[PDB]
């Protein structure tokens, strides 16, 4: 067809960043380091 | 040297210090920024009143008792009478703003209790009447006083059940939203940096609240024996990267 | 024309078939995408965020106290809480992990269980957090519990323990619906030493419990959930 | 030490009236209160736990209310099995002291 | 992809399993952080939990009833079900609504499948071969008042003709005014004391009007029309706390008074299994 | 079925130790605490003490020097042993168990009287 709405599903994005939801902190916190000095 | 507990936040002529912080949240890892031209549709040159509005405004303190249910504020509604930011909000048709939110509650090493401090984008409240009943304008726009979740239901007002987040979703699942805890053992301050979150580039600021701040006791306040059974909670909010478009006469809202 | 034979399933409407279809709005130009924060690409991102477990579901009404695990001062060796690990059921059914998991039939991988202590800063407790892998009962006396996967948690300036429940299964996938063959085992917490409160403090202190998934977590075979339901269609 | 103060010591009403025992504590209990009834020559029976939740085999007449330091057992439209003793007990921070007691005798 | 790394005994000052959830971050603690692990591989890409797949299957979103009968002397053709129209929403049926309301903003093209089924409950003697018109009616287009008036000729409205018994199929692009649809809207259309909360035109997807094209038979025919929606090219933003309570209304987060407890009560104490 | 059964001597002399045994059934003493409560005839319930599920005890603030609670996990028996009984110790003594951290499943009780 002529329209982008007509096409089928996009597929998997493989971006997959959970860090914006799981580590949304300003200062980087390393795993194993003390969380607060 | 570098300590995660000791923080300084300076915006405008206002400064906040804390010596018992827990590493500020930047919501969705996105620092607030100005609207770029590629996302803009409004053709007006925007006003950016930088140091006069991007500064900390302190709201009235609440009193956290042992039977407190929690408190909710709406943004930008909680700042609608705050200085020049409140004046620009009613004189402009359009406006966008990020926020630095700073919730403050100190106690002793003998006190226990935990506050959830959460920012909820598009926190559409439920009515207590059920069905298809609306919540009236004056209840979703309370100003600096916010909504006390231990207060009684009113006609046209929201439901105030803290277990259902005033919207029919459970309290324990608010942690998908950007949040911090104020656990009195650990920290006395929560800091959350909110970018502008909306489906439009800029928006009306008086008919729409972009985000809501909820401060919810989870672990109830336990004071040592003989001590005062209450703690004060103070909310301080700084707008940031604030733009205003469409200057006209001052809007008249129900108040 | 070119000759054609028509196959079985012709004219069917399969609700998961992903095919092209004609646009009812030719030459339509949708609104420009603007940048919005917090874009979700995949649900495996957001089940790694920990949400609270209503582990104290001993009340006849939903309340904030259902999320509070009580600790008591003069208690040695005893149990703090226990739960089975049917993550589409029980205490986990209303959590964010449990609600996304109920959209799928199969799950695999490791779970992330966190406890946050909320007592006074001048209080001390050592607890032991035990995962009992399946094939045995839920443990009864802390000696039974520490024979499995466990953690001794010293409560101090860092207030949160993270007990990963590691994927301990012979079969590669488990059912999200509670099923005895694919039971995940048991979780329990025990006083390792005891809770010691400071002077002029009294009563109970509370634990907050958290559940999320590790990044090895797998989830497949999408299905309807029973959590939401209706009897009639909704209106304006 | 936490002491429970229960009021009143005696209530006299008919079957169908509504009584309300009142429980007050010297300190905050955080709803860690139980209500017991006790017949004459009888063990006490748990009726309300966590100051609001009805126990097993308890009818919907009994309603536990109250929080903090003030707690209330309310019996709506008394039936014939409701007469006898009623005791507070807090279960926050040993000792688990009782209230004084409240009698229901027939008007 | 490595699912778990090999890891042996630790005796160390780096303690990954102690953290502070006051920060609002959940640390990515692995099983190799607290037990000894072997090497395993994922063999798993996570494709079925993509938001394109999770929101991308056809869900029934509306059931409506229209009738083929004699229309002579009927005052209100809408009330007599000679036609019916539906403001298109994805919140009337609650299995799809709970999935969409995991997110705050959602942008997608729509794919509609419309199934029409007939029945004759009272004394028919044959097969009624019927055609349904389904007309996409945008805001401001003239709405039908009669089943056979001037509005159905569809000179600018897209409409679709299909037989009763088989189905219709078309796609509609993302037609939101904003960059995404609002699943949730904490606001009002304007600054006013009485105006409605939450319901916004920022999730308006159009409207469909349905009628039976045939005139009428001797008997009555009831046509059930089932609209199925499939989202595609899906983009979603701001994950939310999932719906726990029953819905009461389209476009509102209201839950009913005196609801049953959603959290299950144990058959025991907190120490039970 | 869960049952706690009190068993006492029912007649004790003053300046002589009382010893009441609580035979329990249907549960383990390693999993549930046991509460002791007395009631003098006419007056109200008084909390005596509690031995918790793994051996720790709490008592009356007023009777702490005068009472001691122990248990035997093998015999399923909880012991209440009070020494130096004055005349105020005449009561019906009850057993309970831990339930949601509270006390219930109260047995029939043994009546204890002390006199010359």
mmCIF file of C-alpha atoms in Angstrom, chain E residues 80-263:
data_model
loop_
_atom_site.group_PDB
_atom_site.id
_atom_site.type_symbol
_atom_site.label_atom_id
_atom_site.label_comp_id
_atom_site.label_asym_id
_atom_site.label_seq_id
_atom_site.Cartn_x
_atom_site.Cartn_y
_atom_site.Cartn_z
ATOM 1 C CA UNK E 80 -34.867 1.351 17.513
ATOM 2 C CA UNK E 81 -31.288 0.156 16.723
ATOM 3 C CA UNK E 82 -31.716 0.703 12.987
ATOM 4 C CA UNK E 83 -28.223 2.119 13.201
ATOM 5 C CA UNK E 84 -25.761 2.492 16.028
ATOM 6 C CA UNK E 85 -22.617 4.499 16.525
ATOM 7 C CA UNK E 86 -19.664 4.121 18.828
ATOM 8 C CA UNK E 87 -17.125 6.630 20.033
ATOM 9 C CA UNK E 88 -13.958 4.612 19.492
ATOM 10 C CA UNK E 89 -12.208 3.903 22.757
ATOM 11 C CA UNK E 90 -9.908 1.194 24.001
ATOM 12 C CA UNK E 91 -11.122 1.406 27.600
ATOM 13 C CA UNK E 92 -14.644 -0.042 27.411
ATOM 14 C CA UNK E 93 -13.431 -3.645 27.606
ATOM 15 C CA UNK E 94 -11.069 -4.073 30.500
ATOM 16 C CA UNK E 95 -8.576 -6.748 29.425
ATOM 17 C CA UNK E 96 -7.121 -4.429 26.786
ATOM 18 C CA UNK E 97 -7.545 -1.382 29.054
ATOM 19 C CA UNK E 98 -5.328 -2.794 31.819
ATOM 20 C CA UNK E 99 -2.579 -3.521 29.273
ATOM 21 C CA UNK E 100 -2.702 -0.015 27.799
ATOM 22 C CA UNK E 101 -2.775 1.558 31.263
ATOM 23 C CA UNK E 102 0.560 0.061 32.179
ATOM 24 C CA UNK E 103 1.813 3.139 30.320
ATOM 25 C CA UNK E 104 0.997 6.824 30.484
ATOM 26 C CA UNK E 105 1.511 7.718 26.845
ATOM 27 C CA UNK E 106 1.087 5.387 23.917
ATOM 28 C CA UNK E 107 1.471 5.971 20.189
ATOM 29 C CA UNK E 108 0.299 3.386 17.681
ATOM 30 C CA UNK E 109 -1.335 2.835 14.350
ATOM 31 C CA UNK E 110 -4.628 0.986 14.652
ATOM 32 C CA UNK E 111 -5.778 -2.117 12.801
ATOM 33 C CA UNK E 112 -9.498 -2.766 13.017
ATOM 34 C CA UNK E 113 -11.266 -6.029 12.353
ATOM 35 C CA UNK E 114 -15.058 -5.849 12.352
ATOM 36 C CA UNK E 115 -17.003 -9.107 12.593
ATOM 37 C CA UNK E 116 -20.755 -9.074 11.989
ATOM 38 C CA UNK E 117 -22.924 -12.009 13.055
ATOM 39 C CA UNK E 118 -26.666 -12.415 12.499
ATOM 40 C CA UNK E 119 -29.501 -14.156 14.318
ATOM 41 C CA UNK E 120 -33.281 -14.428 13.872
ATOM 42 C CA UNK E 121 -34.871 -15.187 17.265
ATOM 43 C CA UNK E 122 -38.544 -14.978 16.145
ATOM 44 C CA UNK E 123 -39.966 -16.986 13.226
ATOM 45 C CA UNK E 124 -37.857 -16.484 10.140
ATOM 46 C CA UNK E 125 -37.856 -18.953 7.300
ATOM 47 C CA UNK E 126 -34.740 -18.107 5.292
ATOM 48 C CA UNK E 127 -31.175 -16.887 4.969
ATOM 49 C CA UNK E 128 -30.876 -13.120 5.114
ATOM 50 C CA UNK E 129 -27.880 -12.062 3.034
ATOM 51 C CA UNK E 130 -27.034 -8.755 4.655
ATOM 52 C CA UNK E 131 -24.444 -6.033 4.067
ATOM 53 C CA UNK E 132 -23.131 -3.844 6.907
ATOM 54 C CA UNK E 133 -21.883 -0.317 6.397
ATOM 55 C CA UNK E 134 -19.267 0.696 8.948
ATOM 56 C CA UNK E 135 -18.504 4.410 8.616
ATOM 57 C CA UNK E 136 -15.557 6.098 10.312
ATOM 58 C CA UNK E 137 -17.004 9.385 11.587
ATOM 59 C CA UNK E 138 -14.458 12.024 12.687
ATOM 60 C CA UNK E 139 -15.446 14.878 15.044
ATOM 61 C CA UNK E 140 -17.441 17.487 13.184
ATOM 62 C CA UNK E 141 -18.662 15.138 10.495
ATOM 63 C CA UNK E 142 -22.485 14.976 10.349
ATOM 64 C CA UNK E 143 -23.739 12.158 12.504
ATOM 65 C CA UNK E 144 -26.542 9.957 11.139
ATOM 66 C CA UNK E 145 -30.071 10.411 12.458
ATOM 67 C CA UNK E 146 -31.831 7.996 10.089
ATOM 68 C CA UNK E 147 -30.540 4.621 8.972
ATOM 69 C CA UNK E 148 -30.940 5.769 5.349
ATOM 70 C CA UNK E 149 -30.262 9.525 5.406
ATOM 71 C CA UNK E 150 -27.842 11.684 3.385
ATOM 72 C CA UNK E 151 -24.950 11.130 5.814
ATOM 73 C CA UNK E 152 -24.259 7.532 4.753
ATOM 74 C CA UNK E 153 -23.113 8.306 1.210
ATOM 75 C CA UNK E 154 -19.533 8.700 2.553
ATOM 76 C CA UNK E 155 -18.161 11.233 0.081
ATOM 77 C CA UNK E 156 -15.381 12.145 2.496
ATOM 78 C CA UNK E 157 -15.902 9.756 5.404
ATOM 79 C CA UNK E 158 -14.137 6.424 4.941
ATOM 80 C CA UNK E 159 -16.682 3.653 5.102
ATOM 81 C CA UNK E 160 -16.526 -0.096 4.570
ATOM 82 C CA UNK E 161 -19.124 -2.498 3.154
ATOM 83 C CA UNK E 162 -18.931 -6.164 4.060
ATOM 84 C CA UNK E 163 -21.292 -9.107 4.327
ATOM 85 C CA UNK E 164 -22.787 -10.285 7.582
ATOM 86 C CA UNK E 165 -21.054 -13.495 8.575
ATOM 87 C CA UNK E 166 -17.626 -12.558 7.333
ATOM 88 C CA UNK E 167 -15.484 -9.699 8.471
ATOM 89 C CA UNK E 168 -13.961 -6.347 7.613
ATOM 90 C CA UNK E 169 -10.330 -5.281 7.952
ATOM 91 C CA UNK E 170 -8.640 -1.896 7.657
ATOM 92 C CA UNK E 171 -5.850 0.019 9.298
ATOM 93 C CA UNK E 172 -6.045 3.533 10.706
ATOM 94 C CA UNK E 173 -2.902 5.603 11.376
ATOM 95 C CA UNK E 174 -2.134 7.231 14.678
ATOM 96 C CA UNK E 175 -4.706 10.029 14.732
ATOM 97 C CA UNK E 176 -3.861 11.659 18.046
ATOM 98 C CA UNK E 177 -3.611 15.423 18.195
ATOM 99 C CA UNK E 178 -0.533 15.163 20.426
ATOM 100 C CA UNK E 179 2.577 13.055 19.812
ATOM 101 C CA UNK E 180 1.040 10.135 21.747
ATOM 102 C CA UNK E 181 -2.336 9.259 23.163
ATOM 103 C CA UNK E 182 -2.936 10.095 26.797
ATOM 104 C CA UNK E 183 -3.980 7.011 28.694
ATOM 105 C CA UNK E 184 -4.173 9.284 31.747
ATOM 106 C CA UNK E 185 -4.891 13.006 31.902
ATOM 107 C CA UNK E 186 -4.704 14.899 35.211
ATOM 108 C CA UNK E 187 -6.645 17.905 34.069
ATOM 109 C CA UNK E 188 -9.528 19.619 32.390
ATOM 110 C CA UNK E 189 -10.463 20.932 28.983
ATOM 111 C CA UNK E 190 -10.401 24.495 30.388
ATOM 112 C CA UNK E 191 -10.381 26.432 33.670
ATOM 113 C CA UNK E 192 -13.897 25.973 35.025
ATOM 114 C CA UNK E 193 -15.489 24.849 38.272
ATOM 115 C CA UNK E 194 -17.878 22.277 36.765
ATOM 116 C CA UNK E 195 -16.098 20.827 33.693
ATOM 117 C CA UNK E 196 -15.200 17.157 33.455
ATOM 118 C CA UNK E 197 -11.991 15.751 34.913
ATOM 119 C CA UNK E 198 -9.768 13.302 33.109
ATOM 120 C CA UNK E 199 -11.751 12.801 29.913
ATOM 121 C CA UNK E 200 -9.752 14.530 27.216
ATOM 122 C CA UNK E 201 -9.748 14.649 23.437
ATOM 123 C CA UNK E 202 -6.045 13.704 23.608
ATOM 124 C CA UNK E 203 -7.067 10.046 23.215
ATOM 125 C CA UNK E 204 -9.816 10.565 20.648
ATOM 126 C CA UNK E 205 -9.537 7.931 17.929
ATOM 127 C CA UNK E 206 -12.663 8.770 15.942
ATOM 128 C CA UNK E 207 -16.093 7.205 15.839
ATOM 129 C CA UNK E 208 -17.781 4.451 13.857
ATOM 130 C CA UNK E 209 -21.420 4.376 12.779
ATOM 131 C CA UNK E 210 -22.920 1.038 11.757
ATOM 132 C CA UNK E 211 -26.060 0.217 9.786
ATOM 133 C CA UNK E 212 -27.529 -2.588 7.707
ATOM 134 C CA UNK E 213 -27.637 -1.540 4.066
ATOM 135 C CA UNK E 214 -30.557 -3.834 3.106
ATOM 136 C CA UNK E 215 -34.060 -2.394 3.315
ATOM 137 C CA UNK E 216 -35.930 -5.032 5.432
ATOM 138 C CA UNK E 217 -37.274 -8.581 5.210
ATOM 139 C CA UNK E 218 -40.571 -10.039 6.418
ATOM 140 C CA UNK E 219 -38.848 -11.052 9.668
ATOM 141 C CA UNK E 220 -36.463 -9.161 11.926
ATOM 142 C CA UNK E 221 -32.719 -9.756 11.888
ATOM 143 C CA UNK E 222 -30.419 -8.896 14.782
ATOM 144 C CA UNK E 223 -26.796 -8.182 13.855
ATOM 145 C CA UNK E 224 -24.097 -8.256 16.500
ATOM 146 C CA UNK E 225 -21.073 -6.226 15.423
ATOM 147 C CA UNK E 226 -17.771 -6.997 17.127
ATOM 148 C CA UNK E 227 -14.936 -4.530 16.629
ATOM 149 C CA UNK E 228 -11.464 -5.883 17.235
ATOM 150 C CA UNK E 229 -8.490 -3.551 17.613
ATOM 151 C CA UNK E 230 -4.825 -4.374 17.100
ATOM 152 C CA UNK E 231 -2.216 -1.761 17.952
ATOM 153 C CA UNK E 232 0.874 -1.688 15.774
ATOM 154 C CA UNK E 233 4.044 0.392 15.454
ATOM 155 C CA UNK E 234 3.603 0.804 19.174
ATOM 156 C CA UNK E 235 5.605 3.242 21.267
ATOM 157 C CA UNK E 236 4.941 3.527 24.985
ATOM 158 C CA UNK E 237 6.231 5.844 27.687
ATOM 159 C CA UNK E 238 6.194 6.159 31.498
ATOM 160 C CA UNK E 239 5.398 2.731 33.000
ATOM 161 C CA UNK E 240 2.736 2.853 35.695
ATOM 162 C CA UNK E 241 1.437 0.935 38.651
ATOM 163 C CA UNK E 242 -0.955 -1.699 37.244
ATOM 164 C CA UNK E 243 -4.695 -1.518 37.775
ATOM 165 C CA UNK E 244 -5.743 -3.355 40.921
ATOM 166 C CA UNK E 245 -9.407 -2.434 41.332
ATOM 167 C CA UNK E 246 -12.428 -2.828 39.028
ATOM 168 C CA UNK E 247 -13.075 -0.081 36.533
ATOM 169 C CA UNK E 248 -16.353 1.819 36.623
ATOM 170 C CA UNK E 249 -16.176 4.202 33.676
ATOM 171 C CA UNK E 250 -14.562 5.017 30.356
ATOM 172 C CA UNK E 251 -11.849 7.638 30.666
ATOM 173 C CA UNK E 252 -11.898 7.801 34.470
ATOM 174 C CA UNK E 253 -9.829 6.034 37.107
ATOM 175 C CA UNK E 254 -12.851 5.674 39.425
ATOM 176 C CA UNK E 255 -13.233 2.394 41.264
ATOM 177 C CA UNK E 256 -16.470 1.234 42.908
ATOM 178 C CA UNK E 257 -17.443 1.971 46.472
ATOM 179 C CA UNK E 258 -17.175 -0.985 48.885
ATOM 180 C CA UNK E 259 -14.904 -3.098 46.709
ATOM 181 C CA UNK E 260 -13.596 -6.527 47.622
ATOM 182 C CA UNK E 261 -9.983 -6.684 48.886
ATOM 183 C CA UNK E 262 -7.582 -7.192 46.011
ATOM 184 C CA UNK E 263 -4.696 -8.502 48.157
#
